[PDB]
Design an enzyme around this catalytic site. Structure first.
Site, short mmCIF file in Angstrom:
data_model
loop_
_atom_site.label_atom_id
_atom_site.label_comp_id
_atom_site.label_asym_id
_atom_site.label_seq_id
_atom_site.Cartn_x
_atom_site.Cartn_y
_atom_site.Cartn_z
N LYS A 153 0.78 -1.35 0.11
CA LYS A 153 0.02 0.07 0.01
C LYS A 153 0.76 1.16 -0.02
O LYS A 153 0.36 2.33 -0.82
CB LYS A 153 -0.99 -0.10 1.20
N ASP A 182 -3.15 -4.35 0.29
CA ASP A 182 -3.64 -3.45 1.43
C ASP A 182 -3.98 -4.34 2.24
O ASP A 182 -5.26 -5.23 2.32
CB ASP A 182 -5.19 -2.82 0.61
N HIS A 183 -3.11 -4.65 3.37
CA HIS A 183 -3.76 -5.61 4.25
C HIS A 183 -4.79 -5.80 4.97
O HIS A 183 -5.11 -6.94 5.39
CB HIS A 183 -2.49 -5.86 5.49
N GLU A 221 -7.32 3.81 17.88
CA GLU A 221 -6.11 3.20 18.68
C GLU A 221 -6.05 3.99 19.77
O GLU A 221 -6.40 5.31 20.00
CB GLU A 221 -4.78 3.44 17.67
N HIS A 245 -7.03 1.66 4.17
CA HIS A 245 -7.86 0.57 4.74
C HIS A 245 -9.29 0.97 4.78
O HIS A 245 -10.20 0.04 4.31
CB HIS A 245 -7.22 0.20 6.07
N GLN A 373 -11.34 -5.84 13.78
CA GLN A 373 -9.98 -6.25 14.45
C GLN A 373 -10.31 -6.93 15.96
O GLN A 373 -10.00 -8.12 15.96
CB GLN A 373 -9.14 -5.19 14.69
N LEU A 380 -26.34 -7.69 16.28
CA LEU A 380 -27.73 -6.94 15.67
C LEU A 380 -28.59 -6.66 16.75
O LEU A 380 -29.06 -7.38 17.77
CB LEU A 380 -28.54 -8.27 14.82
N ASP A 399 -25.80 -11.62 19.55
CA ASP A 399 -24.42 -11.66 19.68
C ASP A 399 -24.02 -12.98 18.34
O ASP A 399 -24.20 -13.98 19.03
CB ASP A 399 -23.83 -11.93 20.94
N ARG A 466 -12.43 9.68 24.87
CA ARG A 466 -13.54 8.90 24.15
C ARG A 466 -13.63 9.14 22.63
O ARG A 466 -13.57 8.23 21.72
CB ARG A 466 -14.82 8.60 24.74
#
Length: 484
Positions: A153, A182-183, A221, A245, A373, A380, A399, A466
């Protein structure tokens, strides 16, 4: 239709002593082999300027090899290393490649190979792709065989530089021969997206402006760029993860259904949806740079010694998007990414519409969350009658945690799945030249605006916060309905 590499394929990693090589490329190769997906007859050759032996190279990568069975599969390790060799030579002159051509033809003439299968993995900065690709076409290109080169990339930093690279690259290697990496396109949950939406009427019928209110792609991050601030200064969070990404993910979320099974039919639909993007609205953004933490325990971006006192470098950005076609016309799309936030997370959030009048209209919006990740999951938000006498509604998170199914299978790392796809000749998870062109056409005017001398000042947000000031409003302003 595309030829599969199996026996007597020779894989040459250029830049083998480099960091990406020993920590991700050779680890991924050993991943494939350890799990029975790399042929024992594969020749693996590492190439770099430095003057090391087969031993040093093998010992350089041995630590980073992933041993999920511990002391077991130790013979697989020792067996994988024996397939690995090293050759030293400069990238800039023919002699290195002419030597290399002799080893390879020697190995290949030693077997019944009248169709050499060659994979060249360029674990290198782009400033050397062109040197190496020129020498590969000059000295190491067999018309009687198939060769494939993987590049990464990095490429360019705007439309102009990316164009100049491809202008040099196209006469050397066709699109059929290039595999641009593009990982994210090798991540399990990203690979799942197309089948999840197109393969399930429960999603695909709602997957349109008639039922979707808001589309978000989210990257968080919890750390800054401490120590590497000056390197990040000319990049910024938009170049770092959003133009590449996150945009890839968005493309998989919004493209139309590919009409054939050719991998190029997938790439056609990504290119098509990209061209439908309206120009980015330079005012429809939220731009942040991480300052001192409320704690005092974390520095500001500027506290970094290799960042100039006046840097307007963006470490957080929320950008609005508009796709002008029948499916998405009028649906607000937000991509947001930032370092030094409160958690680490890559996530798709889709909010569905409510009917306005009727019995169940005071009911909350349905919502789909795909975590990419962390703990690969699908959630839902649903509505259902309260069991029993009551007729009140209650919301239910379903879940679909994929983490339990993913221990019954071998879930490869992104580079392992991408190298495999290359061996198979499948371009589905790789960036085409026109895809690249268009995605830089979309983002360059915004980057030119931000990085010009009359570009705005990012607002400062504390390390670990946050979400910077204004983010919650910005989402509400892009179709998101908050709830309890």
């Amino acid at each position: 239709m595309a030829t599969q590499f199996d026996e007597n394929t020779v894989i040459t990693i250029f830049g083998a002593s480099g960091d990406l090589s020993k920590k991700k490329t050779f680890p991924a190769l050993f991943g494939l082999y350890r799990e029975g997906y790399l042929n024992p007859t594969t020749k693996i050759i590492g190439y770099a300027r430095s003057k090391l032996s087969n031993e040093d190279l093998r010992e350089k990568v041995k630590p980073f090899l992933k041993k999920p069975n511990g002391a077991k599969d130790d013979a697989k390790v020792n067996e994988f290393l024996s397939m690995v060799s090293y050759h030293a030579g400069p990238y800039d002159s023919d002699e290195g490649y002419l030597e290399l051509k002799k080893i390879i033809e020697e190995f290949e003439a030693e077997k019944k190979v009248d169709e050499p299968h060659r994979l060249f993995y360029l674990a290198l900065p782009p400033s050397i792709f062109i040197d190496v690709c020129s020498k590969l076409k000059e000295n190491l290109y067999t018309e009687s065989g198939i060769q494939r080169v993987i590049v990464e990339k990095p490429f360019g930093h705007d439309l102009q530089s990316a164009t100049e690279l491809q202008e040099k690259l196209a006469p050397l290697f066709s699109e059929d021969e290039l595999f641009r990496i593009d990982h994210y396109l090798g991540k399990e949950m990203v690979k799942n997206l197309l089948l999840m939406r197109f393969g399930n009427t429960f999603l695909n019928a709602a997957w349109n402006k008639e039922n979707i209110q808001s589309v978000q792609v989210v990257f968080k991050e919890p750390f800054g760029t401490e120590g590497r601030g000056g390197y990040f200064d000319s990049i910024g969070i938009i170049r770092d993860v959003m133009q590449n990404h996150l945009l890839q993910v968005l493309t998989l979320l919004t493209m139309e259904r590919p009409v054939s099974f050719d991998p190029e039919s997938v790439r056609d639909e990504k290119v098509k949806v990209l061209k439908a993007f309206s120009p980015i609205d330079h005012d429809d953004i939220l731009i942040g740079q991480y300052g001192r933490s409320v704690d005092g325990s974390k520095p500001s971006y500027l506290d970094d010694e290799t960042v100039k006192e006046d840097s307007k470098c963006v470490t957080f950005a929320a950008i609005g998007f508009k796709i002008a076609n029948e499916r998405w016309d009028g649906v607000p799309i937000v991509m947001r990414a930032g370092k030094a936030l409160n958690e680490g997370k890559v996530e798709i959030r889709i909010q569905f519409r409510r009917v306005a009048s009727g019995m169940f209209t005071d009911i909350p919006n349905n919502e789909l969350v795909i975590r990419i990740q962390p703990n690969e999951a699908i959630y839902l938000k649903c509505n259902a009658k309260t069991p029993g006498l009551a007729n009140e509604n209650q919301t239910t998170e379903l879940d679909l945690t994929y983490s339990e199914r993913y221990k019954n299978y071998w879930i490869p790392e992104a580079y392992e799945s991408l190298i495999r796809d290359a061996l198979l000749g499948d371009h589905s998870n790789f960036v085409r030249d026109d895809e690249l062109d268009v995605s830089w056409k979309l983002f360059t005017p915004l980057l030119n605006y931000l990085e010009g001398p009359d570009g705005p000042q990012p607002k400062i947000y504390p390390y670990g916060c946050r979400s910077p000031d204004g983010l919650v409003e910005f989402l509400a302003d892009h179709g998101y309905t908050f709830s309890k």
